[PDB]
Amino acid sequence: GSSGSSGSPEYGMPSVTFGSVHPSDVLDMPVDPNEPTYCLCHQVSYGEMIGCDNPDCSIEWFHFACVGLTTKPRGKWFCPRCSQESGPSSG
Numbered sequence: 001g002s003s004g005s006s007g008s009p010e011y012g013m014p015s016v017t018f019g020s021v022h023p024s025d026v027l028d029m030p031v032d033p034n035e036p037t038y039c040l041c042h043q044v045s046y047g048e049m050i051g052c053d054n055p056d057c058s059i060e061w062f063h064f065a066c067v068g069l070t071t072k073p074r075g076k077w078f079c080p081r082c083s084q085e086s087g088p089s090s091g
């Protein structure tokens, strides 16, 4: 019979470097629908708003056509999710 063996080392080290900056330019265009949503309906928070008087309320922001608010009470208006009051007549 017979047999044998062998071997060989190995190594390496790459190298790369670069970098560049680009200027800014606000093209002539109006706003975009890419706005955040607050109201429960998850729709763009527009002017029509009242804000929940409750400071704890995370949303504390809704519309009028979602909670029936003819106008902005700018007073003591609590969202229909916080009030959760209990009585004879529900609503």
Ligand SMILES: [Zn+2]
Pocket: 039, 040, 041, 042, 043, 062, 063, 065, 066
């Ligand atoms: Zn809404």
Ligand SMILES: [Zn+2]
Pocket: 052, 053, 054, 057, 060, 078, 079, 080, 081, 082
């Ligand atoms: Zn609330």
